[PDB]
Design a protein around this ligand. Structure first.
Ligand SMILES: Nc1ncnc2c1ncn2[C@@H]1O[C@H](CSCC[C@H](N)C(=O)O)[C@@H](O)[C@H]1O
Lengths: 265, 265
């Protein structure tokens, strides 16, 4: 009679941990959500096949408004699993679901999986140097989000790197590309004119982390803004002050212009 | 002709991903290092039995100084795996190893696994709110390093959380406990007197992340400094001002005192 929060990882069904698979295989009921992120290398069918169980996919509304009405009731008399892309508690509001579980007298356990938050290490940027993170959200009607711009500014001032999760509208099958994020940021720059994000700003793009051949690119906005980084999901990173080896990796592995090997200490 | 950087995950032999395991099983040679961290919930023997391959352990020197003489030569005409605790390329100097592979004409691929950087989300603290990270190092001789204290200071004043890795002597198998970290920080506070880390400071402790029964505790330093958080590894976090939802999770899940709902929000 417990509830398992199990992450499925970055790209495909094989990104789940062995621990997660063995536990998921023995659960009575299996639920999942695929609106918090995109696993571009798999399908519901493949996940079901691997786990050996049928999976009931839930919408944001099902979860946020009815988690305690759909999932928790079953967890009070069975072993239930709730699957999610990447790590279940990273950049989601799922942690609060553990509180709902407690209040309902249901014990819960978390099985982690690879997350985009730590996968950034593949960009060569020292992970400890990342500062506050943010999300580039799609403008809606007259509402144009801009707080993510101030985050970059705050981190840059401290010489820290900025991780930018990109927006997603799963129900509309919309996945923000690094290109779109760059366009939005340039627009905010025109408004705020803080010299935070311009055509000459160095950026790093990581697409489909978790796949065997992810797209890792680095360069100035003007040169990458119209580049094809492949299918989603994508994340955008605005590095702060670079260490020599970070610059070297970006050039040798991310194909950045040799010009960036030159660091301004 | 191929080198695989494979993460072993957080705690035991089952924290490796299905993808990582299947690939490791297909490799002709398997190397590993346990100097950046140790898998406290398992043993080399259990990891070997799981992968079904003998695992040649490499020391810090083997890797940092002779990676190209020990690992790469074999990767030239065979499939080779390099296992590391957590997620590959998180340890600061590992990304550079991919450059060495390139220089040696060896292709490399990264197989991700859970990292403490994302696993800390189990503390209920929002991932985007974490700022720069640091390691609490033991003082020694005439050397008393305190930069980690400055990191906490800079993050906190900006309302950001600070992830603190605790010192470890892998070879001697000696881990710094959260308790020792707190005493050190209080000692540093007495030195710099910046009102950054005191007996009333709210801290969070995460022990054995990855296990099914991790220890998650939160409260003021004066009340936690003498508490038993169990066996290592331990991770210390000095949260910035809390979102009410973060505070509620710490109270309901981490046994934090009701007081934080008004004092640290
Ligand atoms: N494999 C991947 N490659 C690139 N970006 C990814 C990614 N997986 C997730 N993201 C990024 O993160 C956003 C979802 S945020 C939810 C993250 C998830 N809990 C995790 O642990 O990874 C996406 O819109 C995208 O910008």
């Amino acid at each position: 009679m417990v509830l398992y929060f199990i992450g499925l990882g970055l790209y495909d069904e094989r990104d789940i941990t062995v621990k997660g698979l063995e536990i998921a295989k023995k659960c009575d009921y299996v639920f999942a959500e695929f609106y918090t992120s995109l696993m571009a290398g798999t399908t519901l069918g493949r996940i079901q096949k691997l786990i050996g169980k049928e999976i009931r996919v839930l919408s944001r509304e099902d979860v946020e408004l009815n988690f305690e009405n759909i999932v928790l009731p079953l967890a009070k008399e069975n072993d239930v699993a709730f699957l999610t892309p990447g790590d279940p508690l990273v950049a989601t509001t799922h942690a609060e679901l553990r509180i709902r579980a407690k209040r309902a007298g249901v014990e819960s356990y978390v099985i982690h999986a690879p997350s985009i938050y730590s996968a950034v290490g593949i960009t060569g940027l020292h992970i400890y140097k990342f500062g506050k993170s943010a999300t580039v959200a799609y403008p809606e009607g007259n509402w144009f989000p801009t707080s993510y711009y101030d985050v970059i500014k705050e981190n840059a001032e401290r010489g820290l790197h900025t991780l930018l999760f990109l927006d997603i509208k799963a129900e509309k099958r919309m996945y923000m590309t690094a290109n779109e994020a760059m366009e939005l940021l340039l627009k905010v720059e025109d408004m705020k004119k803080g010299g935070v994000f311009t055509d000459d700003t160095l950026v790093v793009v990581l697409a489909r982390a978790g796949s065997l051949n992810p797209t890792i690119r680095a360069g100035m906005v003007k040169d990458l803004i119209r580049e094809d980084f492949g299918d989603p999901p994508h994340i955008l990173i605005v590095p702060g002050k670079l260490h020599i080896v970070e610059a070297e990796y970006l050039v040798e592995i991310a194909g950045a212009p040799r010009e960036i090997l030159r660091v301004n200490v």
